[PDB]
């Protein structure tokens, strides 16, 4: 959806890449036909300086790069509880499962959450009721012990006009809000930087 | 064919565009003047010339010209007991050229006489079939050394043409039917000094070098293939240590470099060195030696140069079968070269200013010393010993230069400043010092005297004073027990009567393997007698004396300490 | 092929015309004069790649000369065959032995292993040295380093430990990975004929790099070692120690790299990026769930002035678990091998250790002699301080303790091979020396079972 | 008495002589090290954008 | 046909760019024509394609870039050397600062001068009788010998050098060629007054660079003093004694020219040609095979921060043949001179010393002091720690004060024999039990 940059230089732990003019500072991207993991440091015109986090052996000029379109950040919904991750939210466990292999090959990525796991969402909130940031709409039983409370993210403020309790994963919309940007709908799950 | 021009000049770095047919490494004639120069970098069309000489006077638009070959040096009949400058220019023969005490520039004159006629004494038979180290005969270059005519490498073939006569190293004195072509062959090869001279194998050294220095050849020894390194503070007693070496030890050339140094001590070596016979011999120790002088005050650049002049000339000494030991005196004025012409370049420098290679490069020099088996049907062993002074600010070893040889090299000779000031020559830290050979050397020792559990036991009470003294410096001597007394009065004696040595005194100035173990016996004695303390003192001085001894004097003493 | 060489700046040299070119990318040169010199893409841009020279740019012709760009970077042709075989830090033959037919190339970086996938360390090594096995254990797995430094005898004790290496039982015996980074011909040399003469070379497989190699080739080899090592751990199912000397020649030839490529140094003067560099080295190791085999870790390095803070072994100290010490006070005293146990660590030698692994006086008499060990050296002091009038009678002892502890138990020498049952025996026999009293850090069940 | 005395300059020679000298010494190196690393670093920036 | 541009391009502290320029060579001297016809003398640093960097000696103060001009003189730096130098004093450019005659000069010398010939080299060892006892017994001076002063700020390094200037079998003297580089005016009249009172000025040469002197100056003003001492000595058959202070403010002037220059920095950010451009001053000194005259060097610097280690004194300590140091110990105890023995050395003393040079007991006595002293002085520093109550060592420390208040401590103004020092140096061993004499046989003990 934003453009995809095209690698200038290669050096060391350092990429520089064209056409990034729509990317952002600190974003996080993928790099080269690998797409391993970096983040753009400087900006300057359309070309972005791009820190490497991986090897760069094998990268070259030519090659794409593509902005994840945000700075690192976390999933934040049910799935969260007794997952082991990386430093920046890679699940160990799905990448045993997945790759089906012992090792984190570069180029790897894979969402932090499940988006395909059934969660029972149980609606507390009723439909008309005036919600801003942090008013819980629901809960789900995620673990064993905890009580996993579904709140209304950061920025969305209106009134609540269709929820109901059923089974969805965290991608699925559980709520309708009438903002005043107009309707938006509710997932599970939110995002955030850490 | 083509002619540079220059379009630059900075100090000893000179740019020169339309340098397109040229080869990196290039030897090359700069400006009018037509001053000596290398190639060191090419961008495009323009050169980066590296020049051995002065350069004031010269600027844009003066010419340039290649000589297509790289640095270089003559490798036959008429090199031993010459000085040559860094490049391999003779000194002598520039005074008689220029007619002047001093040295200018611009003036390329050949190595060795090409004009001098030498008897060639032919020993191989015609019919022979031959390859590169292959010896063709010689020619008795001193009384003692033969100057050995081997097969250049790149040429095989069968031998069709020879005979004994006398000739200049012009002549062509054998031909060989090789695969392109007949070649003919004279006494004399040329050979890029930045190039090691090939070998059949390398070996290890084993044999242990006799120096006639107590502390060297005792605690910290070196083998005939070894690499030692002498660091220490300037007035440490720097060149009487290395002259001792040259004139003591037991190889068959010696070839010394003055490396940035004091031209003074050349003057010295080749007056001094003509005057010292080998009594078994009777001809001096110059008629085994080649030197290679470029002062502090001559062109920087020509410093690298001499360095690798010195080491080539003894591969191709090594090559004929002989022990060869090199002296490099200092390595830190070659260092400090790298540095000047690095930053020069404008490169990243390491610690120091010192080029990020200085590592490596250390590393090129001493893997070029060792014991050897030479290319040659014969498998003849030879070998390099390299003697390295180094010259860190204020002796802190810290410093690049002496921690980045201390890596490559395996004796380490620490002069320290303290030793020098209350006059304790040579000014060895006994402490410091180490030598990777000493278990090798113990081993040799035992089975030729029939000594590794003394020399063992003479460092451990040289380490035990050391550990007692860091007490006692802060803390006083007062409460030591009478073993404590005896440790110390053992180390005093060590040091005094067998460490310090006179390289001016006409008997203390060598010390022969016998000799050596029959005065760290005495000491040993002494020790252990006594061992077995205010009493014991008041009832020595024969054994102060031991090292002046002309034996049965020395060995006597054992028994008169137990009496 | 490409006849565009565009600038030669000492070994390095840029290249223009490229395209589809990467980074570490293998070069070949073919000189106006046909020899052929290999090389490695040190950067690469748009129009151009800069690249060095294993060889030299001596005598090359800019003009006349060809650069071919290989579309690879090094890579390692394994396989069970390489077991017996020598070959340098490119994993070029040494030995000139027989032809070698690789069942795949792989790239020598290695992948990082799944933390969660590594399993715990279990089963205790006997290298045959008490100081090491005793003391600081080493186990199945393990990374655990020797510190050492110029002109201390680790080149001995590397051969030592390779030579005596061995698991109890098994029946599985060790495959010994050994690299040698910018040594010497003559250490070189030691280490070949010491695996030679041995037979140990039947279980070895060594790449040898020595100091006047180039400096690419140098940061080449602990990679092509681990590669080696992994795939005949991970693949083949081998128990596999790696032992590297010198790791500190190794991070010089990076310092020799980043400068070339006009890097600003980080902390001392080395690459910022060290840290990661020798993390992604030390961690290709231990063992895996569900895999047979396994990788042990021994690297050696020497500490430039014998400085445990700089950076060499300060950052390995953070990724090993421990790190064995050797001294040159030891050394001087005559002490073989001169480890010295109180500033040594190894971190997992809980987990290889007691009834079951070695025995179950092995952890009591650990912790009884380092406690001895350190009060007798106190005494020595004491004695030196103050005079042989200060001390008591069991202040004697601990002096006595001590000496003798330095000079038959640590100092074994360099070919001596002790089993854990020797070294535990040992210990007990100089611990005979102190009273009950003071064995306090020994419980009485296990004191009067073994005590003599 | 006399043993006391000479004890007694002992400890306090060490007290108020050697320890500190020991003290202020290391406190200096430590200093001195540190401002020419920077200075270092400083220089190698600078000879990096040349 | 003169060569001038007016195309100066920029003017930055003491550098000075202009382009335009064709057949300017390197290190060629300049002359910057200013808009007010003020003349300002420059060298050319670097030269390329037609461009060329010049550094200013007087400096660029005043300069107006459109209106001035620089002219190409086509040769180096030179000296105008001449016998009627002697008694006359120059400037740091060597142009004549006594309103005395033009000399007429009999050549001219590139300043930077030429190498000699390593073969064509000749031996310094001539005992040259300095009359202080520290330097003619333990440092002892040859003819042809550099042996510079290692000092510090406020200490009498410049009554030392006069000293020995005036009091160092044969009749020959020595011509003095005197150097002042940034130094004082207090500093350099002291040197005047002491040359004219002893008229030594009739036998000096002077180039005087003083403190409020343009800086640059200085990196020329030692290579014109060496130039005319090797033209007296080896042209006009003259023993020449050089000396030169503060070699320490030379080695300011060459960094303040690496700092504009923005070279890659060497030690404390002095450049890393230290080494060479001081060698390249030290080693104009010695003799020659054939030729009748000498070049001794004495050179002084102060040790900045009184540090041994530090770039100036270390190098130098490198290249010279020895060093004789002075101390703010010995000199705030009223030594005079003050000099340090033990950290001083002469590398030439061996072969200028003994039987027929000296005396025979020179060597053996010399040892013996050293050992004595250095013994001495340890036990003084133990005594002044622990208290004055072993037997023997309380002899040593008695020895080290009769050594410093009696031996070293002469007097600015005392002249000394070779004779009178050895016979004291042996009243001083006197003192020792001659069991404690090792350094010396058993010959020289009877004898002496």
């Not at chain 2, 005074?95 to 008897?119: I, Y």
């Not at chain 3, 004491?382 to 003798?404: C, N, P, T």
Request: a negative charge.
């Amino acid at each position: 959806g934003m453009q995809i940059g095209k690698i200038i230089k290669v050096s060391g732990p350092l990429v520089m890449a064209e056409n990034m003019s729509e990317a952002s500072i600190q974003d996080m991207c993928l790099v080269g036909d690998l797409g391993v993991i970096g983040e753009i440091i400087e900006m300057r015109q359309d070309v972005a300086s791009i820190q490497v986090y991986e090897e760069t052996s094998g990268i070259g000029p030519g090659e794409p790069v593509r902005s994840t379109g945000e700075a690192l950040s976390v999933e934040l919904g049910p799935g969260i509880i007794s997952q082991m991750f990386d430093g920046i939210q890679r699940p160990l466990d799905t990448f045993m499962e997945v790759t089906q292999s012992n090792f984190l090959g570069r180029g790897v990525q894979l969402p932090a959450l499940d988006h395909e796991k059934q969660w029972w969402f149980e609606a507390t909130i009723e439909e008309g009721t005036e919600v801003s940031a942090g008013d819980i709409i629901g809960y789900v039983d995620e673990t064993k012990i905890i009580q996993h409370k579904i709140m209304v993210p950061n920025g969305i403020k209106g009134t609540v006009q269709k929820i109901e309790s059923g089974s969805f994963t965290i991608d699925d919309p559980i709520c309708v809000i009438e903002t005043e940007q107009g309707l938006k709908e509710l997932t599970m799950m939110q995002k955030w930087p850490v | 064919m083509q002619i540079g021009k220059i379009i630059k000049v900075s100090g000893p770095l000179v740019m020169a565009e339309n340098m397109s047919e040229a080869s990196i490494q290039d030897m090359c004639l700069v400006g009018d003047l037509g001053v000596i120069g290398e190639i060191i970098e090419m961008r495009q069309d323009v050169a980066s010339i590296q020049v051995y000489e002065e350069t004031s006077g010269i600027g844009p638009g003066e010419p340039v010209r290649s000589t297509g070959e790289a640095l270089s040096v003559e490798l036959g009949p008429g090199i031993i007991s010459q000085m040559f400058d860094g490049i391999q220019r003779p000194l002598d023969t520039f005074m008689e050229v220029t007619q002047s005490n001093f040295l200018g520039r611009g003036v390329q004159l050949p190595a060795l006489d090409h004009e001098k006629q030498w008897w060639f004494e032919a020993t191989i038979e015609e019919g022979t079939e031959v390859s590169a180290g292959d010896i063709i005969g010689y020619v008795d270059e001193t009384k003692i050394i033969q100057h050995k005519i081997m097969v250049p490498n790149g040429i095989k073939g069968t031998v069709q043409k020879i005979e004994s006569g006398s000739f200049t190293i012009d002549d062509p004195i054998c031909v060989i039917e090789t695969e392109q072509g007949l070649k003919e062959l004279t006494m004399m090869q040329k050979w890029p000094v930045r190039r090691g001279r090939p070998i059949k194998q390398k070996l290890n050294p084993d044999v242990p070098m006799i120096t006639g220095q107590r502390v060297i050849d005792t605690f910290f020894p070196v083998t005939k293939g070894g690499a030692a390194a002498v660091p220490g503070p300037f007035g440490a007693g720097k060149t009487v240590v290395q002259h001792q070496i040259a004139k003591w030890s037991d190889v068959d050339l010696v070839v010394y470099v003055g490396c940035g140094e004091r031209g003074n001590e050349m003057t010295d070596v080749v007056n001094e060195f003509p005057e010292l016979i080998d009594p078994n011999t009777g001809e001096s120790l110059m008629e085994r030696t080649v030197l290679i002088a470029n002062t502090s005050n001559m062109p920087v650049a020509a410093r690298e140069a001499s360095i690798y002049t010195g080491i080539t000339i003894a591969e191709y000494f090594r090559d004929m079968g002989y022990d060869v030991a090199i002296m490099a005196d200092s390595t830190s004025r070659w260092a400090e070269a790298l540095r000047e012409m690095s930053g020069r370049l404008e490169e990243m420098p390491g610690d120091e200013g010192y080029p990020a290679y200085l590592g490596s490069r250390l590393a090129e020099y001493y893997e070029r010393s060792g014991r050897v088996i030479a290319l040659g049907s014969d498998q003849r062993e030879g070998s390099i010993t390299a003697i390295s002074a180094v010259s860190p600010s204020g002796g802190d070893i810290s410093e690049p230069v002496t921690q980045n040889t201390l890596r490559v090299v395996k004796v380490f000779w620490g002069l320290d400043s303290s030793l020098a000031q209350k006059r304790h020559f040579p000014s060895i830290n006994w402490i410091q010092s180490y030598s990777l050979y000493s278990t090798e050397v113990g081993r040799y020792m035992d089975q030729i005297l029939q000594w590794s559990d003394m020399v063992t036991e003479g460092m451990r009470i040289l380490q035990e004073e050391e550990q007692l003294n860091e007490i006692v410096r802060l803390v006083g001597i007062d409460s030591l027990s009478d073993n404590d007394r005896l440790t110390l009065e053992v180390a005093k004696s060590i040091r005094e009567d067998y460490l310090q040595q006179n390289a001016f005194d006409d008997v203390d100035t060598f010390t022969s393997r016998e000799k050596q173990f029959n005065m760290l016996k005495v000491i040993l004695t002494f020790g252990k007698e006594a061992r077995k303390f205010n009493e014991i003192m008041e009832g020595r001085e024969r054994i102060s004396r031991s090292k002046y001894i002309p034996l049965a004097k020395i060995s006597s003493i054992n028994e008169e300490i137990k009496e | 092929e490409y006849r565009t060489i565009k600038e030669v700046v000492g070994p390095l040299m840029a290249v223009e015309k490229v395209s589809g070119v990467k980074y570490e990318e293998l070069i070949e040169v073919r000189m106006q004069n046909g020899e052929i010199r290999r090389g490695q893409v040190l950067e690469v841009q748009e129009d151009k790649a800069m690249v060095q020279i294993f060889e030299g740019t001596s005598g090359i012709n800019l003009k006349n000369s060809s650069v071919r760009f290989l579309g690879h970077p090094l890579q390692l042709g394994v396989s069970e065959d390489m077991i017996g075989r020598v070959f340098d830090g490119l994993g070029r033959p040494k030995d000139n032995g027989p032809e070698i037919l690789p069942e795949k190339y792989l790239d020598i970086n290695g992948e990082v292993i799944n933390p969660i996938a590594r399993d715990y360390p279990d089963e205790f090594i006997q290298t045959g040295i008490s100081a090491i096995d005793h003391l600081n254990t080493l186990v199945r797995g393990q990374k655990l380093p020797v510190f050492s430094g110029s002109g201390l005898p680790h080149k001995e004790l590397a051969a030592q430990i390779a030579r005596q290496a061995t698991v109890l039982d098994s029946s599985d015996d060790f495959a010994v990975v050994f690299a040698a980074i910018g040594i010497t011909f003559e250490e070189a040399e030691f280490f070949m004929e010491d695996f030679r003469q041995t037979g140990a070379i039947d279980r070895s497989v060594m790449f040898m790099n020595l100091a006047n190699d180039p400096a690419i080739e140098r940061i080449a080899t602990p990679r092509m070692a681990l590669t080696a090592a992994e795939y005949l751990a991970y693949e083949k199912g081998m128990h596999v120690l790696v032992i590297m000397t010198d790791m500190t020649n190794y991070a010089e030839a990076l310092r020799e790299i980043s400068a070339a490529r006009r890097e600003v140094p980080g902390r001392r003067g080395y690459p910022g990026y060290l840290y990661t560099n020798l993390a992604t080295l030390f961690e290709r190791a231990g063992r895996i769930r569900g895999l047979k085999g396994s990788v042990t870790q021994i690297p050696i390095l020497t500490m430039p002035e014998d400085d445990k803070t700089h950076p060499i072994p300060d950052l390995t100290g953070y990724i090993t678990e421990g790190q064995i010490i050797l001294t040159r006070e030891l050394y001087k005293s005559g002490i073989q091998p001169p480890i010295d146990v109180l500033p040594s660590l190894s971190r997992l030698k809980d987990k290889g250790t007691g009834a079951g692994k070695t025995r179950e006086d092995h952890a009591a008499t650990m912790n009884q002699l380092f406690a001895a060990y350190a009060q007798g050296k106190q005494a020595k002091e004491l004695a030196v301080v103050l005079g042989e009038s200060a001390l008591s009678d069991i202040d004697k002892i601990y002096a006595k303790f001590a000496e003798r502890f330095e000079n038959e138990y640590v100092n074994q020498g360099f070919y001596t091979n002790r089993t854990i049952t020797e070294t535990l025996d040992l210990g007990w026999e100089l611990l005979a020396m102190l009273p009950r009293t003071e064995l306090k850090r020994i419980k009485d069940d296990l004191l009067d079972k073994y005590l003599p | 008495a006399e043993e006391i005395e000479k004890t007694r300059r002992r400890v306090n020679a060490l007290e108020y002589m050697t320890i500190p000298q020991l003290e202020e010494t290391i406190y200096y190196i430590k200093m001195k090290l540190e401002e020419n690393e920077r200075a270092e670093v400083t220089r190698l920036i600078k000879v990096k954008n040349m």
